[PDB]
Amino acid sequence: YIPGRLDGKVALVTGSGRGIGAAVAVHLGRLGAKVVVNYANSTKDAEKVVSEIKALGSDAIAIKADIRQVPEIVKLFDQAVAHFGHLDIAVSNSGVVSFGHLKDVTEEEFDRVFSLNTRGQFFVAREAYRHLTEGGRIVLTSSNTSKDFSVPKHSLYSGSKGAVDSFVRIFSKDCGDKKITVNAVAPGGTVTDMFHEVSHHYIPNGTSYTAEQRQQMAAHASPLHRNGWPQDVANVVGFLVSKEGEWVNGKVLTLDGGAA
Amino acid sequence: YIPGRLDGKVALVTGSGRGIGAAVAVHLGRLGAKVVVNYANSTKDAEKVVSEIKALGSDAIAIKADIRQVPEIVKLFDQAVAHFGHLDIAVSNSGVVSFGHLKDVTEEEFDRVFSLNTRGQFFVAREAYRHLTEGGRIVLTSSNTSKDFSVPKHSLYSGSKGAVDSFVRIFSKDCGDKKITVNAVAPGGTVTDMFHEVSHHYIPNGTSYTAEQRQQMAAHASPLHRNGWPQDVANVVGFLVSKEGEWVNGKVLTLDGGAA
Numbered sequence: 001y002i003p004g005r006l007d008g009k010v011a012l013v014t015g016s017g018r019g020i021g022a023a024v025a026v027h028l029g030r031l032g033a034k035v036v037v038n039y040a041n042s043t044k045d046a047e048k049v050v051s052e053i054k055a056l057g058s059d060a061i062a063i064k065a066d067i068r069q070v071p072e073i074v075k076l077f078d079q080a081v082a083h084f085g086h087l088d089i090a091v092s093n094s095g096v097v098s099f100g101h102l103k104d105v106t107e108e109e110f111d112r113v114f115s116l117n118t119r120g121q122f123f124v125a126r127e128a129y130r131h132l133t134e135g136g137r138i139v140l141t142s143s144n145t146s147k148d149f150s151v152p153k154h155s156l157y158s159g160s161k162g163a164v165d166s167f168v169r170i171f172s173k174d175c176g177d178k179k180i181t182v183n184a185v186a187p188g189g190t191v192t193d194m195f196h197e198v199s200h201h202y203i204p205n206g207t208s209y210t211a212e213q214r215q216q217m218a219a220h221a222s223p224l225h226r227n228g229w230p231q232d233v234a235n236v237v238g239f240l241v242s243k244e245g246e247w248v249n250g251k252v253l254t255l256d257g258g259a260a
Numbered sequence: 261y262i263p264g265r266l267d268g269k270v271a272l273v274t275g276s277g278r279g280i281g282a283a284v285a286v287h288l289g290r291l292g293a294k295v296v297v298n299y300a301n302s303t304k305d306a307e308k309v310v311s312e313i314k315a316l317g318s319d320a321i322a323i324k325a326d327i328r329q330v331p332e333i334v335k336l337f338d339q340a341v342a343h344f345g346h347l348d349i350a351v352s353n354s355g356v357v358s359f360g361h362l363k364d365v366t367e368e369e370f371d372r373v374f375s376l377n378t379r380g381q382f383f384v385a386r387e388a389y390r391h392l393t394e395g396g397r398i399v400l401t402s403s404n405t406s407k408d409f410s411v412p413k414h415s416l417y418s419g420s421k422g423a424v425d426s427f428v429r430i431f432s433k434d435c436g437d438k439k440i441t442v443n444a445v446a447p448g449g450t451v452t453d454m455f456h457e458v459s460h461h462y463i464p465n466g467t468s469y470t471a472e473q474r475q476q477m478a479a480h481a482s483p484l485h486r487n488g489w490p491q492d493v494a495n496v497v498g499f500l501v502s503k504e505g506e507w508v509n510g511k512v513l514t515l516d517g518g519a520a
């Protein structure tokens with residue numbers, strides 16, 4: 001047995017096609033877990049991630065699910081257990097971003113956001129509790145915008161994650177009857193191929209700066225003067241889902257490199 | 261002009277039929293506002309509240325709305341403005357409580373709770389922003405269970421209010437362009453005719469105590485050794501919606517008599 005490692009464990013990771021989720025899936029594999037690469041859209045991308053994990057020496061399988069549909073969350077978890085025999089760890093990176101002044105937010109947008117970010121993650125936790133081995137791990141994704149960062153015209157998204165913060169604190173109480181810990185990670189601005197299409201929303205008069213200037217401004221918000229990267233979040237998830245992360249339970253960890 | 265008072269103002273109060281909302285509606289009337297008594301169920305009860313407000317010397321009107329239905333929120337606010345000429349203050353006391361272990365929470369229950377407590381209150385705020393006079397006031401209802409109090413088997417409700425906390429902080433940014441402040445009150449256990457039917461959920465082995473013992477236990481949780489009452493919340497709402505409450509903006513105030 002090697003401390004910090006996940007040898008002999010089985011982990012399920014949602015939102016694995018891209019960005020943060022992909023880095024998390026690969027990292028848990030690097031740590032020695034077999035990985036269910038759950039994803040929402042591109043099967044080719046997901047199989048890419050599977051292939052990286054196998055190249056590292058761990059087994060993986062891509063299982064698609066629309067996490068807005070609770071019946072698909074149930075089948076995802078059933079299939080995860082049937083394939084690998086058991087499931088120890090469940091990490092949700094499922095979510096969508098949204099912007100707009102309160103006055104302009106529609107019913108349809110509210111539902112688009114809450115169905116995935118809040119309702120979807122809630123039922124990922126339910127199904128993880130139901131399927132997990134004793135002593136397991138659940139990690140959901142919040143955001144620095146929930147409590148630590150105030151962005152005008154970002155109320156809907158901020159509240160979608162505020163819900164998750166409260167969920168995990170109470171989930172840790174309920175899930176203690178299988179000795180499963182429940183936490184959330186709350187990333188700040190993290191660079192992916194999508195960062196550049198939305199970074200203007202986070203800066204006053206953002207469209208009057210170039211993408212590169214906006215990335216650099218995001219970098220300077222941390223006193224370390226660099227951007228957050230998907231590996232930064234994976235590193236912390238990896239610790240939380242390890243044996244050694246056990247005493248962190250019912251908490252939300254803001255991962256912004258010291259910006260707040 | 262009398263500091264703290266609301267003379268010449270028009271206020272709309274949701275959830276006014278009963279409990280906290282009723283006390284809030286009557287209080288804003290006692291402070292000199294004309295009141296739209298919005299309610300969900302009993303018209304007779306709502307007209308009772310209207311009658312109290314008129315007996316105090318202020319005008320009031322009962323307008324029903326199902327706050328789960330955004331089209332009815334729009335009409336409620338349109339009708340409020342058409343009746344009184346303008347609207348200055350909007351207070352939501354809309355919500356339902358829910359209990360259950362994570363493992364047993366259904367899609368239907370999630371939706372029952374979030375549609376009112378979170379989605380409904382969000383759109384009350386939207387419509388209040390859209391209809392309010394400059395310099396107005398929006399107050400939503402959170403709960404001590406959002407952040408300050410951890411109740412096992414209460415994750416769904418806790419997260420429904422966690423969302424509201426994040427909403428109001430960001431709403432205060434957006435609503436500043438009409439100089440409207442936005443806050444929430446987060447009551448703890450507050451005695452109403454309903455308190456006794458659910459107080460067992462908040463105490464380990466609660467059903468093995470009598471209703472009166474449970475009420476007394478709730479009283480002892482505050483270092484003032486009394487229960488919270490609807491007037492306790494009304495008093496604070498009244499301050500927030502006054503001129504003198506202006507510098508409290510974007511905040512959630514936990515009203516538990518010092519329990520936390």
Ligand SMILES: O=c1oc2cc(O)ccc2c2oc3cc(O)ccc3c12
Nearest residue numbers: 188189190198199202203217218221
């Ligand atoms: O581009 C971003 O994407 C994000 C995404 C999130 O989920 C949370 C925060 C951010 C975020 O914060 C910033 C601060 C700046 O000064 C500049 C850019 C950003 C920026």
Ligand SMILES: O=c1oc2cc(O)ccc2c2oc3cc(O)ccc3c12
Nearest residue numbers: 448449450458459462463477478481
């Ligand atoms: O009965 C209650 O109803 C509530 C309703 C709420 O919305 C929040 C908190 C409570 C609450 O906290 C308690 C603590 C005790 O020790 C005993 C009873 C209660 C109790």
Ligand SMILES: [Cl-]
Nearest residue numbers: 015017039040
């Ligand atoms: Cl994905």
Ligand SMILES: [Cl-]
Nearest residue numbers: 275277299300
């Ligand atoms: Cl009501």
